[PDB]
Amino acid sequence: GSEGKRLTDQLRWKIMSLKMRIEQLKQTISKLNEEMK
Amino acid sequence: EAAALRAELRDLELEEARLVQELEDVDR
Numbered sequence: 190g191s192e193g194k195r196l197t198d199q200l201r202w203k204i205m206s207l208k209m210r211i212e213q214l215k216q217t218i219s220k221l222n223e224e225m226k
Numbered sequence: 227e228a229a230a231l232r233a234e235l236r237d238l239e240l241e242e243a244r245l246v247q248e249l250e251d252v253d254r
Contacts, residue, residue, distance in 0.1 A: 193249060196228060196231065197227065200228065200231040200232065200235060201231065203227055203235055204231065204234055204238060206237055207235070207238040207239065207242060208238060210227075210239060211238060211242055211245060213242055214242070214245035214246065215245065217249060218245065218248055218252065221248060221249070221252050222252065225252070
């Protein structure tokens with residue numbers, strides 16, 4: 190829709206993408222620590 | 227609203243950057 194809503198949406202999208210990545214990093218860090226010695 | 231969302235974004239970016247560092251540190 191409008192300029193302002195497009196801004197809000199884009200920010201909401203970046204936030205959702207960031208939490209997904211953050212969750213992936215945590216899991217990847219655990220697996221590697223399980224792998225470790 | 228936008229201000230709140232930007233704040234939240236900044237926090238998650240900081241948290242991301244910590245985690246990437248933490249991944250780096252497991253190897254080294």
